[PDB]
Structure 1
Amino acid sequence: MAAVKTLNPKAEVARAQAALAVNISAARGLQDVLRTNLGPKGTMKMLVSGAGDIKLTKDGNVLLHEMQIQHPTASLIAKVATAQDDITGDGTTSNVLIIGELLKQADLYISEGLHPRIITEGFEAAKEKALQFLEEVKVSREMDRETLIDVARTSLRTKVHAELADVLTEAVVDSILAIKKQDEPIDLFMIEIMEMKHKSETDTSLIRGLV
């Protein structure tokens, strides 16, 4: 049906509008799955492995690994989210949603005969302007305990139950403030994370030492 199929009969090819359709459909599927994760009002997902292990999570990256998906565009987006998680540790669901919406909005004009190159140029200009706006809009503050507690809350509340998040806020803030040295990079390897399975979930705490 195409040039490649003549040389290799057992070849799968998607060309021209088919390529865009396939990629945008995969991105929209991923976005539709991950919409419900965003925000503290998100919905927990049950993930069951082949061996029968039960994992309850709402993390975007953890969900992306555990989705039973075998799509190329999904693989690319999963790699991008994995890099996000590895470097910053947050925003994977935001990556998936923003990528899906970007592709959808681009297709909204591409279906009208517009070439994708113009859309990409507009994307680059908009990204430059948005970066400038982000630089001017940021709030530079002295990182006292209250601000760190607020950030930890804004993360954990969107990750776990409200009361458990409240406990974990003091836990994580105190740990970071304990291991932090003045004007030096923070070594997260120096915070041991040990699991015990004999008490309630609100019994988790921080120990000034090692276990």
Structure 2
Amino acid sequence: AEVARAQAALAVNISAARGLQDVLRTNLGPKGTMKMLVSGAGDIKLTKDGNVLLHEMQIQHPTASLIAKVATAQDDITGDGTTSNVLIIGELLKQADLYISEGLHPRIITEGFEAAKEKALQFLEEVKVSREMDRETLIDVARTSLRTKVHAELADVLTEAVVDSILAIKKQDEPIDLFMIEIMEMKHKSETDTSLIRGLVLDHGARHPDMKKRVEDAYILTCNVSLEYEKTEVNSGFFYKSAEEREKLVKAERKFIEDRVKKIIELKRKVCGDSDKGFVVINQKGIDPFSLDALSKEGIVALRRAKRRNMERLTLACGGVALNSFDDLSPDCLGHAGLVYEYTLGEEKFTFIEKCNNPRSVTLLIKGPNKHTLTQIKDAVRDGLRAVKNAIDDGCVVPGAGAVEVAMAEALIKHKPSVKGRAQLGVQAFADALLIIPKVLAQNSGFDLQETLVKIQAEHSESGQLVGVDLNTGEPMVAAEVGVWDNYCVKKQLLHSCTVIATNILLVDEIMR
């Protein structure tokens, strides 16, 4: 058919990106906002985080495909910077644009970049200082990594709970939290909130006065497939070989229910000795009223509807083995939660599996009556969880609020890449994308992304001072004192995911449809 070539294909590329990018620039720091997102489903989503906006919907361009790619990098590889990663490239693109606006090769200006990124990486090592993984040292990173991602006040209460979650570790040291994430969204009088609740929490537990709400000594038979069949890890018919056989099973189906409670009432006394130790069958389907009562009446807690995750985290948490049957099991495999506690909050029971024998799994209780509030608060958590988890995995920490970038753009002082000056321009180009965080904020916040940053620049050129645009009012300060300190996992990776995709479009002279 047709194609596009020369700078015509290039113009479509570089324009579509920076046409999409500044749309995303509306949000960063706390002075960013929460961008309304409605995908084909019709749900409104408000996110200052990149991955949501990037991976849901896009104004469709050939560039819109690569942007989520390196967006699939930042959140994956780090989780802090998804908001920050986008704003870097087009600021660098408009720079390089100038050089090819002058006219030049996108190839020679390509070679003018990555060294500067490699430089800044060096410079990032240089300017940063390794910092404590201490809880309160994390806070200044925690708020910021959250706050660069999501708005302050949410990030502020998240600063507490996220650190409380990432400090909950057994010293399983990760960039993210897999197990520390157990999210319980609850309809509540609090529309945006997250409650930290330790230990594995079960999707539900069953009510009955004889059924113990408090199990401190738990022998947990994980229970999935219901009372209604004998020794069955899956519910299926023992009958229905003809038309009238349909009636016979349900006539004999109530038998297995009593057979099954018979197993559990004895398996308690088998394993637990007397009934003082609550024998825990968490029945991940509904417990039939008779055995619901008769397990209650025997002291067994028959818990209604845990999760497959609450089955696997149980295998983790309780240090015991799960099962898909209620069958009598050897007392060994039965899980032990140092606390099995059914917790009715609102009308809903959330059964704590606590004293996790592997407390890498904790639980967050999310709050809202309105899902649009309840979704958004859930969203701000986890992108900041792994962000602040990049705080406590990192003994190195990089000070935020433009402290380190003026330590690059100025210390990139040119003719160090003197050869063609294309690097001297490319590093200059790269130097100019560094300050987008000092830019976007003094942009979003008061004064000017420029007239404040000149102080930042100046005040950094002053006394080598760590200095930066406020995340809040957009005025100069000392960013080291403020404590705004970016994850050491962000900075390096934040650079890589930029210049690698910033390299591609330059070498792309061609597009065809």
Q: Deviations over 1:68-87 (max 9, x none)?
A: 42211111111111121111
Equivalent residue runs for 1:13-32 within 5 Å: 13-32=3-22
Which of 182, 190, 194 is 1:200 aligned to?
190
1:115-161 CA distance string (max 9 Å, x none): 11221111122122212111111111221111111111113334445
Alpha carbons of 1:105 and 1:63: their partners in 2 closer, same or farther (altered >3 Å)? same
What's the CA shift string for 1:182-206, capped at 9, x where partnerless? 7788752243122112230455211
Q: Please state whether the residue corresponding to 2:111 is helix, strand or coil.
A: helix
- 2: distance between equivalents of 1:164 and 1:97? 22
Alignment partners' CA distance in 1, 2:192 and 2:46: 17
Separation (CA, whole Å) in 1 of partners of 2:118 and 2:124:
10
By how many angstroms is 1:173 displaced? 0.8
Q: Note closer, same or farther for the CA distance 1:56–1:203 as it changes in structure 2 (3 Å cut).
A: closer
Residue 167 and residue 124 in structure 1: after superposition, are their counterparts in 2 closer, same or farther (change >3 A)? closer
Please name the residue that 2:38 is paired with: 48
What residue number does 1:105 align with?
95
User: 1:203 and 1:47, CA in 2 relative to 1: closer, same or farther beyond 3 A?
Assistant: closer
Deviates more, 1:198-207 or 1:155-164: 155-164
Query: For this pair of structures, how many residues does the alignment match?
Result: 201
SS of 1:111's equivalent in the other structure is helix
SS of match in other structure, 1:87 = helix
The whole-number CA distance in structure 1 between the counterparts of 2:174 and 2:148 is 29
Q: Which moved more, 1:136-145 or 1:48-57?
A: 48-57
SS of residue paired to 1:204: strand
CA separation of 1:188 and 1:206: change in aligned 2, threshold 3 A: same
Q: 1:179 to 1:99 in 2, by over 3 A?
A: same
Question: In the alignment, is the contact (CA less than 8 A) between 2:83 and 2:148 conserved in 1?
Answer: no
* Counterpart contact for 2:29–2:150, Cα < 8 Å: no
Is 1:169 aligned to residue 169 of structure 2?
no
Between the aligned partners of 1:187 and 1:90, the Cα distance in structure 2 is 13
In the TM superposition, what is the alpha-carbon distance from 1:17 to its structure 2 partner? 1.0
Do 1:153 and 1:166's aligned partners in 2 also have CA atoms closer than 8 Å? yes
Deviations 1:56-99 (A, max 9, x none): 22212211223342211111111111121111012123222111
Name the TM-score, length of structure 1 as normaliser.
0.85
Deviations 1:167-192, CA, capped at 9 Å, x for gaps: 22111111111124277887522431
| Counterpart in the other structure of 2:460 | none
Tell me how far 1:165 sits from its aligned partner. Answer: 2.4
**SS of match in other structure, 2:165:** helix
Structure that is richer in helix per residue = 1
Structure 1 residues 119 and 143, CA, compared in 2 at 3 Å: closer, same or farther? same
Is contact 1:36-1:42 (8 Å) kept? Answer: yes
Whole-angstrom CA distance in 1 between matches of 2:167 and 2:29: 26
8 Å Cα contact 1:180-1:186 kept in structure 2: no
TM-score of the pair, normalised by structure 2? 0.37
In the alignment, is residue 37 of structure 1 matched against residue 27 of structure 2? yes
Q: Unaligned stretches of 5+ in structure 2?
A: 202-513
- Contact kept in structure 2, 1:85 and 1:92, CA below 8 Å: yes
Q: Secondary structure at the match of 2:167?
A: helix
The structure-2 alpha-carbon separation of the partners of 1:168 and 1:69, relative to structure 1 and needing over 3 Å to count, comes to: same
**Residues 184 and 70 of structure 1, relative CA distance in 2, 3 Å threshold:** closer
- Structure 1 counterpart SS, 2:195: coil
Question: Residue 124 and residue 36 in structure 1: after superposition, are their counterparts in 2 closer, same or farther (change >3 A)?
Answer: same
CA RMSD of aligned residues (A): 2.2
Deviation at 1:108, TM superposition (A): 0.5
Give the 3 Å change call, closer, same or farther, for CA 50–121 of structure 1 in structure 2.
Answer: closer
More strand by share: 2
Q: Once structures 1 and 2 are overlaid, which stretch shifts more, 151-160 or 86-95?
A: 151-160
Question: What's the counterpart of residue 145 of structure 2?
Answer: 155
Q: 1:40 to 1:112 in 2, by over 3 A?
A: same
Greater displacement, 192-201 / 156-165: 156-165
Percent identical residues: 100
Residue 136 and residue 93 in structure 1: after superposition, are their counterparts in 2 closer, same or farther (change >3 A)? same
Preserved CA contact (<8 Å) 1:152 1:169: yes
Q: How far, CA to CA, are the matches of 2:172 and 2:74 in structure 1?
A: 27
Alpha carbons 1:167, 1:202 under 8 Å: kept = no
Q: Tell me the distance in 2 between the aligned counterparts of 1:39 and 1:185.
A: 21
